[PDB]
């Protein structure tokens, strides 16, 4: 369910971001999505452990 | 949107959210167009926030 969260970006759908935005701003949108999903995965791995 | 460049040379044309190059592939609905005149130095005031 964490896939549908925007994490403060433009949109949750990744292909929409890559198909609507130039790489100068797609870089920071990608960065925000990566850090949000990486934090979620870190929490999941800690709870699983 | 190919008729935009054929009218006049633009001043700023800075775009937020979507790039002003890949505007012929994404699909959406119900655009909104508003028109007014600004006295030169306050064009940058027409911006989010």
Curated annotation (Swiss-Prot), chain B:
Region spans: Integrin-binding motif: 39-41
Function text: Attaches the virion to the cell membrane by interacting with host receptor, initiating the infection. The major receptor is host ACE2. When S2/S2' has been cleaved, binding to the receptor triggers direct fusion at the cell membrane. When S2/S2' has not been cleaved, binding to the receptor results in internalization of the virus by endocytosis using host TFRC and GRM2 and leading to fusion of the virion membrane with the host endosomal membrane. Alternatively, may use NRP1/NRP2 and integrin as entry receptors.
Summary of subunit composition and partner proteins: Binds to host ACE2. RBD also interacts with the N-linked glycan on 'Asn-90' of ACE2. Cleavage of S generates a polybasic C-terminal sequence on S1 that binds to host Neuropilin-1 (NRP1) and Neuropilin-2 (NRP2) receptors. Interacts with host integrin alpha-5/beta-1 (ITGA5:ITGB1) and with ACE2 in complex with integrin alpha-5/beta-1 (ITGA5:ITGB1). May interact via cytoplasmic c-terminus with M protein. May interact (via N-terminus) with host bilirubin and biliverdin, thereby preventing antibody binding to the SARS-CoV-2 spike NTD via an allosteric mechanism.
Protein's name in the database: Spike protein S1
Native organism taxonomy: Viruses, Riboviria, Orthornavirae, Pisuviricota, Pisoniviricetes
Entire-sequence positions represented here: 365 to 413 of 1273
């Amino acid at each position: 369910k964490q896939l549908s969260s925007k994490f403060g970006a433009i949109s949750s759908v990744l292909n929409d971001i890559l198909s609507r935005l130039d790489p100068p701003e797609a870089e920071v949108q990608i960065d925000r999505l990566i850090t949000g999903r990486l934090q979620s995965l870190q929490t999941y791995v800690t709870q699983q452990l | 949107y190919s008729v935009l460049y054929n009218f006049a040379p633009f001043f700023a044309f800075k775009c937020y959210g979507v790039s002003p190059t890949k505007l012929n592939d994404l699909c959406f609905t119900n655009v909104y167009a508003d028109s007014f005149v600004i006295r030169g130095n306050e064009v940058s005031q027409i911006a989010p926030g």
